């Protein structure tokens, strides 16, 4: 379905150069990803560790299918930014069902809705995003060494093109260029990792290597040293892409350089797909019996990375004044928690790893939505700060600084509370969902003897809570540097809106001002749902937590 | 018994070898042409501190073990304590030596008492279901076990506290305990 | 043995390069070449056509990477005006 | 004590030094691709060193403390 959707969308895209089509090509892509959800939902009625598909090259697991569907929902939610206009005009005279379904509202919307904005004029943008999803989902399903390499490339190359699709931005071309170059270094490590596996073992099957590994677990000419340190090189190439330290340096720069609607999808999807792929590898390569092979486990990179990602993520985030550089360092400290749960391989830690990855991906997406919405709200607001005048590419990243958020609770209080709840959920404060995620990973690590990493993580969090609180301190504790626009609210300049009925006949003409201009519903509803999921998780935790209890039971059974 | 002087050089060669490449990386990122032999010109001090901190961690860690002949978590604390104290001496400041001896001293006590998972953790080799079941339903314990733990007295006055207390006082102070009859009759 | 030697040239020609980004993008092409060579030489030793098949697919994606690279490099040059990498 | 050492060996001291420690690690973020590749290759080297040498984990902890606390030292 995703492949039919790419080919069909590409044929329609290839016979048009009309930039007005970008909004409708994005709306059709959301319809396409909804069919993919209906198909992977139908495929969920089997209990199995894995079923080889297509000549052994691909596999399907309950974990593989629940993760494709999650990627599809997340993609539908990110695709909304390019599918609907940011702003809106709302009047009580146009607010009933008969009004919405049988009346029309005519007015000059070109400036109010930013019809000709850059996010609304890239025809191929949904198409390149579908290719990244195609690569992401194929990687979760990869069962061969060759399949892994092609799938990570199909995911990576599209992220390079998305990072560069704003071609008139010197900031995106630079972010795109850094990411392509250093990710190409990352892939050369991944190719070396796979190449050493096939060269020492004669097989491209992951299923064959897991069998060789399980026999070699006993308790003289061909000791299987290659598996642990071929997998080590293979692993470093994936720690670059999830931006786990000490391979993290690119992500603050790239995420800060590319536009914010783009940094939303590029900073979230690669992690879900890569972490799920590594989970099956870590389970099937663990030597239950202590052995010489155990002393050299490739998974110690993951602990070293999780250790480093905790210190690096929270400390370097202390003196970040740029909101996108802050969001990326917050991610490097959260991937440390993810890595720690991935390195302790146990039922409790696999439940914790699965819960943490889904909740952080919805929470980091809320953070991006609030950020994007806050910088679309500043349309009827004006500032006189020299710093806010000296910024670069203000159209692609409307909010670039933490200080730009100073006094936002006095401009829009509920959106500021929504960002407070999301940030407090990154801290790990109860009874929010992020606390429960952090507690589940601490409980698993404490049970399995990783007492030292648990102590690092708790001390690390208080350090990271410092810069999270400086964000909230900026929202709540000072006064706005932004002022209502004096001419958009002047009581002398008002545009005319006119309400017609089902057949091109006028009903009522209205005169409207800037106070009649609001955020479009698709973004306020999306922020509202994720905020309330985060807020009220304690009353709605049973089905979500049980979904992860069962997947772990299937993976560790038999 | 371990050769601390022989060990520490091996400990110095390992850690000091790492600072060699961090020195080489510093030379490469230099913006001015100094030449290949600059590795020991300015960068020599960086590898020397890596060399100094490493073996100073090992000799003292080893020398502590030879002092009493027992292997446990604490020995790594002393060696770590010294390795940090060595870090400050490069800067030349008493607070740094103490602030550093405290930090890397406590780090290498914690990871050695807790078994940092960077080389795995202890294998269960037993029924995990049983171990949790046993620790949860051993709700009553023999009175001897608590007495060995908390002692006796301070409110832990078991049956037989008074009979033994009289004997214990006699063997120490040489006084026979006999409370007064405290009654005109009987 | 030429496999390691070639792989080390492309790794340092990528990391130690202080000239320009086309030479950056060239050095990736060298590393992939050395890995393909290791895979091609092993496959002849193990009578495996799969290794040659794997090699051919690393050539096709290595050309896809170099086209995406040259395309991104042009975009960057149009705006920056130099693809020279600057030290000091 | 109170408006003194208690604060210095505590919140104010951790505040002052942690701010400096993080400015220094931010200093490595020069956004130049060749420097970043060298950082990636160095971490690639050190993970190989840690693994196949079968180093005791204490060296790694000490190396990190030593790096963090030479990153604390300026210049």
């Amino acid at each position: 379905m995703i492949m039919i959707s790419i080919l069909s969308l590409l044929l329609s895209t290839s016979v048009t150069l009309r930039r007005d089509m970008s909004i409708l090509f994005n709306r059709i892509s959301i319809i396409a990803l909804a069919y993919c959800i209906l198909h992977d939902t139908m495929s969920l009625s089997f209990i199995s560790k894995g079923i080889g598909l297509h000549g052994g090259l691909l596999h399907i697991t309950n974990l593989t299918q629940i993760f494709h569907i999650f990627i599809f929902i997340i993609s539908i939610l990110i695709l909304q930014l390019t599918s609907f206009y940011p702003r809106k005009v709302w009047i009580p005279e146009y607010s009933s069902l008969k009004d919405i379904f049988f009346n029309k509202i005519l007015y000059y919307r070109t400036k109010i809705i930013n019809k000709m904005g850059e996010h609304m004029k890239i025809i191929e943008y949904p198409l390149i995003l579908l290719f990244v999803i195609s690569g992401a989902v194929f990687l979760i399903s990869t069962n061969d060494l060759v399949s892994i390499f092609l799938s990570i490339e199909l995911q990576s190359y599209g992220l390079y093109l998305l990072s560069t699709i704003y071609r008139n931005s010197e900031l995106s071309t630079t972010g795109g260029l850094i990411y392509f170059l250093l990710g190409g270094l990352s892939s050369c490590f991944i190719l070396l990792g796979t190449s050493l596996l096939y060269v020492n073992s004669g097989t491209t099957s992951l299923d064959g290597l897991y069998i060789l590994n399980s026999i070699s677990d006993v308790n003289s000419w061909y000791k299987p040293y290659y598996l642990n340190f071929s997998l080590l090189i293979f692993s470093i190439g994936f720690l670059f892409k999830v931006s786990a330290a000490p391979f993290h340096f690119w992500s603050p720069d790239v995420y800060d350089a590319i536009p914010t609607i783009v940094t939303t999808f590029v900073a979230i999807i690669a992690k879900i797909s890569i972490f799920i792929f590594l989970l099956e590898l870590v389970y099937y390569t663990n030597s239950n019996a202590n052995s010489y092979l155990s002393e050299f486990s490739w998974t110690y990179a993951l602990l070293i990375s999780s250790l480093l990602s905790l210190i690096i993520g929270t400390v370097v985030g202390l003196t970040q004044f740029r909101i996108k550089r802050l969001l990326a360092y917050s991610t490097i400290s959260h991937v440390g928690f993810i890595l720690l749960a991935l390195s302790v391989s146990s039922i409790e830690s696999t439940q914790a790893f699965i819960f943490y990855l889904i909740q952080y991906s919805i929470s980091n997406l809320n953070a991006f939505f609030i950020l994007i919405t806050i910088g679309f709200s500043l349309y009827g607001y004006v500032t006189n700060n020299k710093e806010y005048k000296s910024l670069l590419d203000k159209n692609n990243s409307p909010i670039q600084l933490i200080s730009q958020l100073k006094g936002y609770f006095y401009i829009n209080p509920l959106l500021s509370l929504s960002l407070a709840i999301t940030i407090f959920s990154f801290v790990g404060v109860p009874p929010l969902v992020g606390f429960f995620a952090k507690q589940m990973v601490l409980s698993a690590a404490l049970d399995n003897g990783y007492i030292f990493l648990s102590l690092i993580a708790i001390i690390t969090s208080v350090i990271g809570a410092v810069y999270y609180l400086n964000v909230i301190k900026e929202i709540f504790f000072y006064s706005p540097e932004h002022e209502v626009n004096p001419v958009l609210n002047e009581s002398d300049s008002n545009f005319s809106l006119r309400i017609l009925n089902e057949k091109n006949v006028l009903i009522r003409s209205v005169l409207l001002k800037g106070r009649n201009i609001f955020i479009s519903s698709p973004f306020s509803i999306t922020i509202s749902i994720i905020t309330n999921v985060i807020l009220l998780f304690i009353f709605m935790n049973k089905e979500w937590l049980s979904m992860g209890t069962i997947l772990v039971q299937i993976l560790f059974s038999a | 018994p371990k050769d601390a002087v022989h060990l520490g050089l091996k400990g110095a060669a390992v850690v000091g070898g790492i600072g060699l490449l961090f020195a080489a990386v510093r030379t490469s990122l230099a913006r001015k042409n100094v030449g290949p032999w600059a590795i020991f010109t300015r960068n020599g001090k960086l590898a020397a501190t890596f060399a100094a901190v490493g073996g100073a961690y090992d000799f003292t860690r080893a020398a502590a073990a030879n002092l009493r002949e027992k292997e446990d978590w604490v020995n790594n604390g002393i060696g770590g304590l010294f390795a940090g104290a060595t870090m400050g001496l490069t800067t030349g400041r008493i607070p740094r030596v103490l602030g550093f001896a405290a930090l890397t001293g406590v780090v290498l006590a914690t990871a050695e008492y807790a078994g940092s998972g960077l080389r795995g953790v202890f294998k269960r080799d037993v029924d995990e279901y049983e171990r949790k079941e046993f620790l949860r339903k051993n709700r009553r314990r023999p009175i001897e076990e608590t007495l060995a733990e908390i002692g006796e007295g301070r409110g832990i006055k078991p049956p037989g506290y008074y009979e033994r207390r009289a004997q214990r006082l006699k063997e120490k102070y040489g006084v026979d305990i006999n409370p007064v009859c405290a009654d005109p009759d009987q | 043995n030429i496999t390691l030697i070639l792989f080390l040239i492309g790794i340092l020609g990528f990391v130690l390069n202080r000239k320009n980004i086309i030479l950056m993008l060239i050095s990736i092409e060298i590393m992939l070449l050395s890995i393909t060579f290791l895979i091609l030489l092993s496959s002849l030793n193990m009578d495996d056509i799969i290794g040659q098949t794997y090699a051919i697919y690393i050539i096709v994606v290595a050309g896809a990477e170099s086209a995406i690279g040259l395309g991104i490099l042009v975009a960057f040059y149009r705006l920056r005006g130099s693809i020279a990498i600057e030290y000091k | 004590l109170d408006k003194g050492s208690i604060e210095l060996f505590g919140p104010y001291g951790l505040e002052r030094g942690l701010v400096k420690l993080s400015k220094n690690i931010s200093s490595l973020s020069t956004s130049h691709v060749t420097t970043y590749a060298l950082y990636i290759l160095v971490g690639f080297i050190l993970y190989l060193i840690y693994n196949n040498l079968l180093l005791d984990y204490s060296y790694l902890l000490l190396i990190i403390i030593l790096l963090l606390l030479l990153m604390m030292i300026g210049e």
Binding site: - | - | N1, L8 | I45, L48, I49
Partner: peptide, 26 residues
């Protein structure tokens, strides 16, 4: 960097290739 990688990856490569790096094999 040259020696450390080369030493590490010399063991990763297999007997099939490391052959032919006074009693030779035929």
């Amino acid at each position: 960097v040259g020696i450390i990688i080369s030493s590490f990856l010399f063991k990763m490569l297999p007997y099939g290739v490391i052959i032919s790096n006074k009693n030779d094999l035929f």
